[PDB]
Amino acid sequence: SVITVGPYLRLHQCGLPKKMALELFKPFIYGKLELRGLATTIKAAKKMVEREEAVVWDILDEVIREHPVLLNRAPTLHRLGIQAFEPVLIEGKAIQLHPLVCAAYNADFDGDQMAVHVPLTLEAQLEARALMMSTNNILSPANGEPIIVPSQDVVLGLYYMTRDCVNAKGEGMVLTGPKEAERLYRSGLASLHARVKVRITEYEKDANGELVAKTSLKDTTVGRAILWMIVPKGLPYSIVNQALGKKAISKMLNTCYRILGLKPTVIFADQIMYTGFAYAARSGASVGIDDMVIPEKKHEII
Amino acid sequence: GVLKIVKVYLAVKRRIQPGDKMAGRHGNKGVISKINPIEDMPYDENGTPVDIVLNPLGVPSRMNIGQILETHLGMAAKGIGDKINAMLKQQQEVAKLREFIQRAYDLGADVRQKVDLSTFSDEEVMRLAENLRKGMPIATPVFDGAKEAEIKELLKLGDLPTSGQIRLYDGRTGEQFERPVTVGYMYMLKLNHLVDDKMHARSTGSYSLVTQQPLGGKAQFGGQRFGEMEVWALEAYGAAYTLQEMLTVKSDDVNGRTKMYKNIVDGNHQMEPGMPESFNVLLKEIRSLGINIELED
Amino acid sequence: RVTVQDAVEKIGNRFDLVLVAARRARQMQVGGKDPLVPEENDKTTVIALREIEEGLINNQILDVRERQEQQEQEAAELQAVT
């Protein structure tokens, strides 16, 4: 079916419609229905799901739960074009696909289609969870570069968030933590980019596997403290102290993967995507006809 | 050898849903992704919600800057239409309608139109305003179109802001979006690549005759082709049982798939592999030549 | 369940993980053995990997338990006969 976005997803799960889910999982639903004792012969179960009564949707949510599926975009070129997700059921008729994963599939949303495949046997469910799961493919096999790099909206939300301007609301005030930085942004007393001394507590792990806390006052902005609320423990503050374009957020996720491993990098990739979408929505970053500024010197050059 | 032909015409009414394809007239495609409620829409300081929220980031890379000029000129057209609706809903006499429609039809440089309403005789002007109240249509020929200053002067005739950008509030939080955003009217088309014509699913359907594999297509209730590059992409992982059931149990081997169906409806979750029957077809086609292919041991 | 990283930290091959967890899930599903960790109505695959993460199951312990519970069956048969 045709794909669509659904940005509420965690990156190990994808949205899958109820009609496709009841068609692809007919034998598991038959086995579940025969186990409970609701029906007797197989025919009765096929009439039940042909009618789609009120009790087979609980059966369907109990066959989905921990059963991965293989999503596949139709021109598969490398191995990151078949990835295994966990379904989340969708009122609708379109596969909801987590956005970061799109940069692996070369999948935009201009009319694309993807195929779902079901691992039937038990070794195949374990291969989908342990080799082909989308959390397991965060580095491209051609090199060392991360393939779950945040693509387009989220880097605009970050670049508007962690930046600065020479005067805003709350210029040069002092803040006792990142929590009241977000509280000053939400209440309407400061701006998202307004330079400010905060007190942040960065955890540097300089010992042999022991995280040592160092707390200090960084001359930073409001947005850099709000984004510091999402960074895991081990990364230093200077990973967010800059302006965070796309190369900088890619090496942010890369340094998180090299230091803190896989699980903080998966949960931190999701928190990056969520905060990028949220502050890009709050940014209101349009495009106008006045934004393309003609040079005044252009006509004399011609 | 046919007795009678009965033809029946069903008439479906397909509305809209997440998954259809809409697009403007400049290449801005898109799968509609969420059909929001009315309240969540960004509204402005008049009260009206916006209908569709596009994405700005498609403009500087995909260089179709014409859609933003079309958006601003559409907002100018609807501003003139709203002023006609205001001057007509208050039951005003035809003199003020004649004044305003004449000012909205002159408005430019040396142009081709040059209409005058002094030869419409007080009844056509009311019916012309009955047709203009949902907006005023504007022609813009291809390479001799409306420049920027004419769009600005027409946005000044309505009481809209000059830059085309209204500040917009939020529907969820109820608090203002910073840095005022671009609204207007774009003329968007629904394309007939719908989503309840592409969506398909198959547990177990019919099987082909010469090679015991599932049929192809949607009208024939068929399964999706697990092609060659996907086989390469599963060799590229270490997924070995997934590929074995992906090309022996789920696809070809008939005794294997009936054993599989009994094992799935009994909770077992186990495959008895066997051989693809299409490999036996390969043996019969190579063997039907003078070639003697076998299976040793 | 999201990641299987520690299940590879305790079985370093990442392919032997699939064999050990498949053997364990086949013992729990059809053979009717109790899980050694209390579940939360998870499926048998996640309970297998959840036993791998505790460390109380790998291929060594599975061979030990299959040899001892095969010797127990044959010992019960021999003491029933003689």
Binding site: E123 | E235, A240 | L19
Partner: peptide, 16 residues
């Protein structure tokens, strides 16, 4: 004989 099946092919190549 590469992925998960390399143990199976080790077993089959050992048992000849």
């Amino acid at each position: 004989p590469a992925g998960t099946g390399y143990a199976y092919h080790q077993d089959r190549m050992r048992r000849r």
